[PDB]
Each structure stands twice: as C-alpha cells, then as structure tokens.
C-alpha cells in the first residue's frame, strides 16, 4: 500500500472536490431561493442572508485549502528499483517450497 | 446616413458571421466543442453590439422616410417590394409571449417599490458579503 503522507493528501483532495460538488449545489438552491424572492413572498427572507453566507464561505476555503495543497507542492519536492531485490525474493520463495516438499508432514 | 451605413456595416460583418457559422455546422462532421464555444461567443457578443449600436442611433432610422424609387419598377417588382415590407413578427413567437403573459398574469406600483427595494437590498447585501472576505 502507499505511504501514509499521500494517503491523507488524497483524503484533502478529496475533501476539495466535495466541497466543490456543495458549492454547486448551494448555488443551485440560491439561485432557486431568489425565484420566489423576487415572486414577491418575504417568508424566506432571512433564509436568503444564511444562504449567500455560506455560499462565500464554502468558496473562500475550498480555495484556500487548494492553495495550501499547491503550496505543499512547492516543497514536498526533494523529499526498476524493486527489480534489483526482486529476482532475490522469487528465490527465497522457491527455496520455502521445497522445503514445503522436503517436509512430508506438512503436504496436508 | 451615416448612422444606417454604420447599421449597414455592423449588420453586414454579422450576416457574414452567420453564414461563417452555418457553413462550419453544415459539414457532416462535428469539429472540436471548443471551436464551437469560440465561433458561439464571438458571433454572439457581435449580436449584442449590433443591439446596441441599434439602440445607439434610433433618431436617424426614425426621421428616414421610405420611399420606392421613380427608377424603380414595380409592376414587375411587386413581390420583392411586398417582401421587404412586410413586418409582422413569425407566429410561434407571437402564441409564445401570449403564453408567457398569460403564466405571468396602486397595486402593482407598490409591488414595483417593493422590488426596488429588494433590489437594492440585495445589492447592498453582496456588496457586505464581498467585503466580508479578502479576495485580494
């Protein structure tokens, strides 16, 4: 498996996306919002200020949080290769069989 | 005159667009999305300045007076004259703005105020929002 460090970066990229996908869809339910605002029915109002806020605030640090991963680009740099022990491990596993088949007690 | 050649050559370089358009859609294959989006916008916003060089020079179309020429024919020419003068608009737009109307449906200029103050509410509110975050 990977190493540890990648694999919360791909969680943080992850999380990014998501909250892209939520920026869209409160976006589309702003954009529904404004429709019967404008029809002229003030119950929703105050749901109208929560909305934009949090619409903001959803685009500010998705963006931030990518800034900061392009950022932990900047200076993760610096920090067949299995192939030279690779040919020496298959070894080791064909010796482990013939002791599988040296030892007839243990074929069952 | 100067303002209608100007329409005429705002409208002309349009058409030619068009036409530009039309032949680069008519071929059996479909060529890139992003050539499309170019072609789309280009021709578009070409369409919004030929609106507003239109709404520019309204004065100059209006004081012109047509008139057929003495040169011109027209016991031969009558259908192309009817051509050009006929102006009623295409039907499926006419049935379509009654139906919009339709949906649609001191009264109504308190709902005006009221939608002018909305609007100026809203546009202040973003105006807060905007200023809420440093976007610089």
Same mark, same amino acid.
């Given at each position: 498996?990977?190493?540890?460090?990648?694999?919360?970066?791909?969680?943080?990229?992850?999380?990014?996306?998501?909250?892209?996908? /939520?920026?869209?869809?409160?976006?589309?339910? !702003?954009?529904?919002?404004?429709?019967?605002?404008?029809?002229?029915?003030?119950?929703?109002?105050?749901?109208?200020?929560?909305? !934009?806020?949090?619409?903001?605030?959803?685009?500010?640090? /998705?963006?931030?949080?990518?800034?900061? #991963?392009?950022?932990?680009?900047?200076?993760?740099?610096?920090?067949?290769?299995?192939?030279?022990?690779?040919?020496? #491990?298959?070894?080791?596993?064909?010796?482990?069989?013939?002791?599988?088949?040296?030892?007839?007690?243990? /074929?069952? | *005159?100067?303002?209608?050649?100007?329409?005429?050559?705002?409208?002309?370089?349009?058409?030619?667009?068009?036409?530009?358009?039309?032949?680069?859609?008519?071929?059996?294959?479909?060529?890139?999305?992003?050539?499309?989006?170019?072609?789309?916008? @280009?021709?578009?916003?070409?369409? @919004? $300045? =030929?609106?507003?060089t239109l709404q520019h020079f309204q004065e100059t179309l209006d004081s012109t007076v047509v008139y057929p020429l003495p040169k011109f024919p027209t016991t031969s020419?009558? $259908?192309? =004259?009817?051509?050009?003068?006929?102006?009623?608009?295409?039907?499926? @737009?006419?049935?379509?703005?009654?139906? @919009?109307?339709?949906?649609? *449906?001191?009264?109504?200029?308190?709902?005006?105020?009221?939608?002018?103050?909305?609007?100026?509410?809203?546009?202040?509110?973003?105006?807060?929002?905007?200023?809420?975050?440093?976007?610089?």
């Amino acid at each position: 498996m990977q190493p540890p460090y990648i694999q919360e970066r791909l969680k943080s990229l992850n999380d990014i996306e998501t909250q892209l996908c /939520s920026m869209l869809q409160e976006a589309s339910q !702003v954009t529904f919002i404004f429709g019967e605002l404008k029809r002229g029915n003030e119950s929703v109002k105050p749901q109208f200020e929560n909305h !934009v806020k949090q619409f903001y605030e959803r685009l500010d640090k /998705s963006t931030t949080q990518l800034r900061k #991963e392009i950022q932990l680009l900047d200076e993760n740099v610096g920090t067949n290769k299995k192939a030279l022990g690779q040919d020496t #491990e298959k070894m080791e596993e064909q010796l482990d069989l013939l002791s599988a088949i040296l030892d007839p007690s243990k /074929s069952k | *005159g100067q303002a209608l050649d100007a329409v005429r050559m705002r409208l002309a370089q349009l058409t030619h667009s068009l036409r530009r358009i039309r032949d680069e859609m008519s071929k059996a294959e479909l060529p890139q999305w992003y050539t499309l989006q170019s072609q789309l916008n @280009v021709t578009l916003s070409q369409l @919004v $300045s =030929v609106t507003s060089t239109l709404q520019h020079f309204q004065e100059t179309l209006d004081s012109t007076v047509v008139y057929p020429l003495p040169k011109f024919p027209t016991t031969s020419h009558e $259908s192309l =004259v009817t051509t050009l003068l006929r102006k009623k608009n295409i039907p499926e @737009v006419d049935e379509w703005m009654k139906y @919009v109307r339709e949906t649609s *449906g001191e009264e109504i200029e308190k709902l005006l105020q009221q939608d002018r103050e909305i609007t100026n509410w809203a546009r202040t509110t973003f105006r807060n929002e905007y200023g809420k975050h440093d976007f610089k």
